[PDB]
C-alpha cells in the first residue's frame, strides 16, 4: 500500500489553464482519499477512480482541480489516505530553486533500408530547471495526440539542467502533405509564453 | 525491501567475454546464488553502502560462464533477512538501427556541443551503448543513456547523450556511437559516426 502525489503538467498549467493533481494509491490488498490545502482554504470536488489491475492489485486514484494562481503562488496540497480507523500523508507544491529555460533541438533521421514509408523525428530538450516539462509535437500548426509520441524521463546533465528526448514516428503522407513538424516544450522558465519550439524537415 | 536481478550487459557478454549478473537489494542481509542446472556457482562480490536517505543498499555481483549463459542457464538470487531468477531472453531478434547527430551551437555556450544518438528497432531490450573518439573508447561516465522503451510497433529504442568541449571536436570531428546487441552482425556491434562541423 503505497501512495504517490503528482504535480500539474506544465501543459495543463500554462496552456490549457486547468491544472490538476493526482493522488495514486497502489493497494496491494483489495480506502478514503481526503484532500486539503496547507493554507486551510477550501478544495474543489475531486474525482475518485478505482480499478483492479492485471496482476490483481487494486489501484485508486483521486484527481483534484487546483487554481492556476494558487499553484503558481506556492500553495501546498495534501493527500491523506485512510481506512475505517493510522494514515498516509502525501503533499505536493511547486519546485523551488534556480530556473533555466529549455533548449530545443529537433532532428529527422534519414531513411533506414526497407522502410521507405516511415521516418522518425526526434527532439532533444536540455538544460532546463526545474525538471517539470511538457513536450508536444505539432504538424500543420495543429497539436498531435499525446499518444503519438513518447518522452523519456528527465535526467540530470553533468553540470546543471535536465534533459529529455522525445520521439515521433511519421508516415510518408504526413511529411508529403507538409514537410514541417514542430517540437514544443512547455516549461515554467521559458519566456515570455512558457514555450520554446523548434521546427524540423524530413527532406 | 525491493529486490532486482539484472542480466549481463551485452558489452560484458560479447566483447569483454566476462559477463556478470547483479542482485540488488534496497532498504545483515544474506544473498545466495544458485543455478537451475544444479552446477556450482562462482564466488560473488557483496557491496554494501548507506545512502543519503538513511537506507542501506546491498548488491551482489556474480560472474557467470559465457557459454553457460548463452546456452540457456537459469540463475537464482535468494534473499534472507524471497527469490529472483534470470535467464537469457527468448523470442524474435532484430538488429539495432543507429543514428548519431550533433546539436548546433546554442547561443551562449560556444565552448560546448551536444552529441546525441538514437538507437531503435532492436529486439530484445538488452543493449550496451558506448562512445568512441578517434577510435578510442570514452569512459562510461562521459555519457548517459535512457532506459529501453517499447516502440509503437516492433522493437525498442534508447537515446544516448554525450557532451563534448571545443578542443575535442577541433582536434578530430570523429565521434562514434556504438551499440552492442546480440542480434547485430557481425561481432554483435553496430556503430555510426558523427561530425560536429
Ligand atoms: C500491479 O500492477 C500495477 C500496474 O502496473 C502496479 O502499479 C504500479 O506501481 C508502481 C510502483 O508501485 C507505480 O510506479 C510509480 O509511479 C509514480 C507515478 O508515475 C505515473 O505518473 C507520472 C506523472 O506524475 C508519470 O510521469 C509516470 O509515467 C506514471 O504515469 C511515480 O511517481 C513513481 O516514481 C517513484 O518511484 C520509483 C520507484 O518505483 C523511483 O525510481 C522514482 O525515482 C520515483 O521516486 C513510480 O514509478 C506505477 O505507476 C503503478 N502503475 C499503475 C498505477 O498503472 C503494481 O505495483 C503491481 N503490483 C505488484 C505487486 O507487482
Ligand atoms: C534512497 O536512495 C537510493 C539511491 O537513489 C534508492 O535506491 C534506489 O531504489 C530504487 C527502488 O525502486 C531502485 O530502482 C530500481 O533499480 C533497478 C536496477 O536497475 C539497474 O539497471 C538499470 C539498467 O536498466 C540501471 O539504469 C539502473 O540504474 C540500475 O543500475 C531497476 O531495474 C528497477 O526498474 C524497475 O522499474 C522500471 C520502470 O520503473 C522497470 O523497467 C524495471 O523492469 C523494474 O520493474 C528500479 O528502477 C534504484 O536502482 C536504487 N538506486 C540505487 C543507487 O540503489 C532508494 O530507493 C531510496 N530510498 C527510498 C525510501 O526512496
Author numbering:
A (entry chain A): 336 to 365, 370 to 424, 427 to 544
B (entry chain B): 336 to 362, 369 to 422, 429 to 544
Excerpt from the publication:
IgE plays a central role in the molecular and cellular mechanisms of allergy, and is a validated therapeutic target in the development of new approaches to treat allergic diseases such as asthma. It exerts its effects through its two principal receptors, FcεRI on mast cells, basophils and antigen-presenting cells, and CD23/FcεRII on B cells. The Cε3 domain is thus the critical domain for receptor binding.
The new crystal forms of Fcε3–4, P1 and P21 ‘small’ contain three molecules (six chains) in the asymmetric unit (solved at 2.2 Å resolution), and one molecule (two chains) in the asymmetric unit (solved at 2.26 Å) respectively. They therefore offer four additional and unique packing environments for analysis of the intrinsic flexibility of this molecule. In contrast, IgE-Fc bound to omalizumab exhibits the most open conformation seen, and is also incompatible with FcεRI binding; IgE-Fc is partially bent in this complex. It is also clear from this comparison that despite the 26 independent chain conformations observed in free Fcε3–4 (and the single uncomplexed IgE-Fc structure), none is sufficiently open to permit FcεRI binding; engagement of receptor must occur at one sub-site before full opening occurs. In contrast, many of the free Fcε3–4 structures adopt conformations that are receptive for CD23 binding. The unfolding event occurs at 52 °C in the absence of urea, and at lower melting temperatures as the urea concentration is increased.
